[PDB]
Amino acid sequence: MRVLVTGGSGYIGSHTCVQLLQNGHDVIILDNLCNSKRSVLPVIERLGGKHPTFVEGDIRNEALMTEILHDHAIDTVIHFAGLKAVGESVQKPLEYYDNNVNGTLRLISAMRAANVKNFIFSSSATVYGDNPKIPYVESFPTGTPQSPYGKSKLMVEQILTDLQKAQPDWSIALLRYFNPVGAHPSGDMGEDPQGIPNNLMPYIAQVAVGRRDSLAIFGNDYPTEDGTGVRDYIHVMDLADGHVVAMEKLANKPGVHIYNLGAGVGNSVLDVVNAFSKACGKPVNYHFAPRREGDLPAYWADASKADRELNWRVTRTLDEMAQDTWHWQSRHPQGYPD
Amino acid sequence: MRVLVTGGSGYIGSHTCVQLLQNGHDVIILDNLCNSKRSVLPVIERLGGKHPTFVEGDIRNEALMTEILHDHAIDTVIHFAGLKAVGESVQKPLEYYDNNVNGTLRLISAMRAANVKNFIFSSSATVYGDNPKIPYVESFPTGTPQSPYGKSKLMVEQILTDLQKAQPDWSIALLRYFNPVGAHPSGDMGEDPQGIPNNLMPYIAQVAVGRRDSLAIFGNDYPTEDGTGVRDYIHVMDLADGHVVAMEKLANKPGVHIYNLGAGVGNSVLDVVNAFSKACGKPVNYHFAPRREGDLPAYWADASKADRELNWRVTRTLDEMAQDTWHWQSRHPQGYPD
Ligand SMILES: NC(=O)c1ccc[n+]([C@@H]2O[C@H](COP(=O)([O-])OP(=O)(O)OC[C@H]3O[C@@H](n4cnc5c(N)ncnc54)[C@H](O)[C@@H]3O)[C@@H](O)[C@H]2O)c1
Ligand SMILES: NC(=O)c1ccc[n+]([C@@H]2O[C@H](COP(=O)([O-])OP(=O)(O)OC[C@H]3O[C@@H](n4cnc5c(N)ncnc54)[C@H](O)[C@@H]3O)[C@@H](O)[C@H]2O)c1
Ligand SMILES: O=c1ccn([C@@H]2O[C@H](COP(=O)(O)OP(=O)(O)O[C@H]3O[C@H](CO)[C@@H](F)[C@H](O)[C@H]3O)[C@@H](O)[C@H]2O)c(=O)[nH]1
Ligand SMILES: O=c1ccn([C@@H]2O[C@H](COP(=O)(O)OP(=O)(O)O[C@H]3O[C@H](CO)[C@@H](F)[C@H](O)[C@H]3O)[C@@H](O)[C@H]2O)c(=O)[nH]1
Numbered sequence: 001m002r003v004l005v006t007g008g009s010g011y012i013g014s015h016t017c018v019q020l021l022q023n024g025h026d027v028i029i030l031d032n033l034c035n036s037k038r039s040v041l042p043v044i045e046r047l048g049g050k051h052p053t054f055v056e057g058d059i060r061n062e063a064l065m066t067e068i069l070h071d072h073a074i075d076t077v078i079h080f081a082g083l084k085a086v087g088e089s090v091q092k093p094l095e096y097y098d099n100n101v102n103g104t105l106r107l108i109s110a111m112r113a114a115n116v117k118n119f120i121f122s123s124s125a126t127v128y129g130d131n132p133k134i135p136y137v138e139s140f141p142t143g144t145p146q147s148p149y150g151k152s153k154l155m156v157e158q159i160l161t162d163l164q165k166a167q168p169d170w171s172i173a174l175l176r177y178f179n180p181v182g183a184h185p186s187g188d189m190g191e192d193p194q195g196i197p198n199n200l201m202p203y204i205a206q207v208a209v210g211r212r213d214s215l216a217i218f219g220n221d222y223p224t225e226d227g228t229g230v231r232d233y234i235h236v237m238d239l240a241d242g243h244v245v246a247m248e249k250l251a252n253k254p255g256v257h258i259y260n261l262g263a264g265v266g267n268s269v270l271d272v273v274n275a276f277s278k279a280c281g282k283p284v285n286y287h288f289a290p291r292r293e294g295d296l297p298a299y300w301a302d303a304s305k306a307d308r309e310l311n312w313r314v315t316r317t318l319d320e321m322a323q324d325t326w327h328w329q330s331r332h333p334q335g336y337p338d
Numbered sequence: 339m340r341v342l343v344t345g346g347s348g349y350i351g352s353h354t355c356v357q358l359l360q361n362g363h364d365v366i367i368l369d370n371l372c373n374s375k376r377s378v379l380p381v382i383e384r385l386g387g388k389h390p391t392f393v394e395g396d397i398r399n400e401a402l403m404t405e406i407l408h409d410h411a412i413d414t415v416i417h418f419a420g421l422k423a424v425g426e427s428v429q430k431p432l433e434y435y436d437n438n439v440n441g442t443l444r445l446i447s448a449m450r451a452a453n454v455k456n457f458i459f460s461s462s463a464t465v466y467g468d469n470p471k472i473p474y475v476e477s478f479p480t481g482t483p484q485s486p487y488g489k490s491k492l493m494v495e496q497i498l499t500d501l502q503k504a505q506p507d508w509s510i511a512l513l514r515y516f517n518p519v520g521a522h523p524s525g526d527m528g529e530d531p532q533g534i535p536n537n538l539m540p541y542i543a544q545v546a547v548g549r550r551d552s553l554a555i556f557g558n559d560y561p562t563e564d565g566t567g568v569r570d571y572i573h574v575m576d577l578a579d580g581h582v583v584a585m586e587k588l589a590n591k592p593g594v595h596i597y598n599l600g601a602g603v604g605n606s607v608l609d610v611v612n613a614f615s616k617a618c619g620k621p622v623n624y625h626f627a628p629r630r631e632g633d634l635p636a637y638w639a640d641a642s643k644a645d646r647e648l649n650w651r652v653t654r655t656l657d658e659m660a661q662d663t664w665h666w667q668s669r670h671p672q673g674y675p676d
């Protein structure tokens with residue numbers, strides 16, 4: 001199929017693009033480069049084994065979106081583009097709402113204009129809000145995200161839902177991601193955050209590479225087995241694979257298809273640290289700090305639905321997640337070149 | 339004060355403008371005329387007793403918004419502009435999200451740019467969602483609106499809230515309206531809907547004027563005193579007055595000030611019909627029809643807070659609401675001239 005991948009040069013999108021190309025689809029990447037570099041493109045094509053077309057631009061530019069859609073005869077759109085720094089979203093809400101809410105709105109508006117009716121959206125477990133019931137299941141009603149980022153994600157899910165209702169021929173997949181980590185097995189592609197990493201894995205990696213002193217473990221008094229926070233980590237490659245499958249199986253299948261994409265099990269901060277220490281051959285330095293604002297104690301996904309309906313499940317392990325990250329970090333300590 | 343009134347040529351905004359001018363404020367009206375006519379302007383100035391400046395344009399045009407803000411040294415913005423047809427919102431969701439969500443977003447973004455930090459937003463009781471507890475009180479957590487229109491209103495309330503948190507110097511009033519009806523006492527200004535009126539009062543008026551046959555009373559088996567739906571109707575003039583007061587008292591008072599604006603009592607469909615029959619001197623024709631999709635049985639506002647904090651309460655009666663509407667309808671059967 002002909003697919004437009006917004007945010008295609010980013011972490012998750014890049015890996016998805018590679019998997020998409022491997023499956024012989026025709027890929028058009030649309031990215032504004034606010035959080036990625038052009039230097040990833042050649043890697044995508046190399047690892048993907050096929051050339052993806054790249055367009056530098058913004059999802060907020062409806063006219064351009066419409067043009068691309070028509071120009072490339074797109075069949076389906078995978079929408080990864082947007083801003084995702086939780087803390088920053090609290091400090092700069094408007095940017096979040098603009099890029100995520102308006103951004104998606106402009107994009108689907110262009111789709112309507114170009115008669116494109118297959119969409120895949122990068123959603124988040126954040127949409128479940130403060131749910132005491134875990135694991136999280138797609139049948140649970142959504143709650144109230146605590147950050148503007150989280151809220152922006154739920155708002156889009158809602159707008160998408162109403163759109164489908166009004167344009168019942170659309171097939172829209174709401175893919176709720178858990179905690180993506182890992183890197184391509186080659187070690188030549190991976191997450192390349194700029195500045196201080198907000199997420200656990202990359203932070204650990206940076207500590208391991210010798211860039212940072214010690215990992216601050218946010219909280220050690222949680223009602224969990226070891227006192228640290230518990231989450232569902234999923235290898236970016238599994239996530240990527242899930243996207244391809246969802247795209248292939250849901251295209252032209254009318255409805256709003258919601259799926260949690262996670263491993264279906266939780267691991268604590270310590271579990272993650274331990275796996276990394278093992279992967280990098282040295283104990284990762286760390287210390288306990290106070291709980292981080294808005295952090296939930298423990299949650300993970302119930303990924304039965306995706307298994308059942310899409311025959312998709314993760315296949316990479318936590319160790320792999322850690323090994324792959326280390327390999328990329330270690331092979332490319334400066335990330336992608338300017 | 340210097341105030342920008344978006345949607346100023348519309349139903350609620352026009353009346354507010356008149357009251358604003360009467361209080362000697364400097365008014366700049368910004369409206370795209372998608373749901374009003376220029377012919378109201380002269381009436382506003384006449385009844386307002388002072389000239390308001392008019393700018394034809396769209397809230398979605400951030401650059402223009404910014405310009406107006408700076409050009410007129412605006413101190414505070416009253417935001418009435420947007421789309422409000424509930425049923426249509428279900429059929430055309432994107433337009434609602436664009437005009438309301440993005441629309442407001444562009445506007446407050448311009449405000450930020452122009453350093454304007456006092457805002458008043460036209461909200462709705464819809465934000466309470468399906469609340470069994472009535473009357474509705476500002477302390478209740480919001481629920482889930484059933485239409486894209488309702489959702490759009492709640493989304494903005496949320497975006498506004500996060501914005502204030504990030505820009506704590508802002509004063510933002512979330513004015514939750516109930517069911518606005520009535521017209522200026524002169525009978526020369528009032529609601530001028532195009533096509534089939536979606537709301538009760540104007541529909542009744544059109545039946546009374548001889549334009550329509552009979553009023554369809556949506557449902558007669560509700561768990562109410564007479565079986566018909568119960569709502570809190572508030573005279574547009576009271577609503578207008580509330581806006582002036584809120585503007586004057588909350589300006590430069592940091593925070594998110596939420597107030598329900600309603601009479602604080604409910605009236606059924608029959609109560610309304612009866613008042614109108616009385617006002618127009620003839621029995622209004624009507625019949626019972628099935629319940630309308632998404633209609634709640636009964637609700638009204640608890641308006642104690644606004645009384646307490648702003649010393650504001652309604653002063654017009656239901657009879658007045660009906661009389662005033664009839665007078666306008668009867669004096670201007672074709673509404674405002676093209
Ligand atoms: N990584 C996570 O932990 C996490 C979990 C939940 C959800 N998500 C979502 O998944 C998607 C992918 O996240 P990711 O980790 O790959 O992030 P990323 O930042 O690496 O990828 C996002 C890409 O979007 C681009 N972009 C941003 N705003 C744009 C705009 N307006 N126009 C065009 N391009 C724009 C960025 O340049 C970047 O390449 C995002 O929507 C994110 O919110 C990721
Ligand atoms: N009337 C009600 O029953 C009801 C109750 C709840 C909330 N509200 C809200 O109060 C506000 C006023 O409603 P109203 O009854 O006066 O409606 P209205 O349609 O008479 O007034 C809205 C005005 O906004 C203008 N407008 C619309 N979109 C615009 C845009 N993008 N740019 C610029 N101008 C634009 C229209 O031309 C119109 O003059 C609206 O936000 C409405 O959602 C009203
Ligand atoms: O330096 C760090 C980073 C993380 N953690 C801990 O490691 C776990 C994972 O934290 P991350 O920041 O990597 O990821 P989150 O669980 O916070 O992210 C989730 O919650 C966010 C807020 O709801 C959403 F934005 C997002 O989509 C979702 O994946 C948490 O228990 C966190 O407290 C640390 O101890 N130290
Ligand atoms: O032709 C009509 C019109 C209305 N009604 C009844 O009159 C009452 C008032 O109906 P309106 O349409 O005038 O107004 P609503 O109560 O439906 O409006 C409210 O509910 C909407 C949906 O939540 C919101 F969009 C909006 O902001 C809010 O004022 C309801 O019981 C309705 O069923 C009739 O019987 N016949």
Ligand code: NA
Nearest residue numbers: 165166428429
């Ligand atoms: Na429809």
Ligand code: NA
Nearest residue numbers: 193194195196
């Ligand atoms: Na960064």
Ligand code: NA
Nearest residue numbers: 334335336337
């Ligand atoms: Na670098």
Ligand code: NA
Nearest residue numbers: 090091503504
């Ligand atoms: Na802040």
Ligand code: NA
Nearest residue numbers: 531532533534
């Ligand atoms: Na109309």
Ligand code: NA
Nearest residue numbers: 672673674675
């Ligand atoms: Na007319």
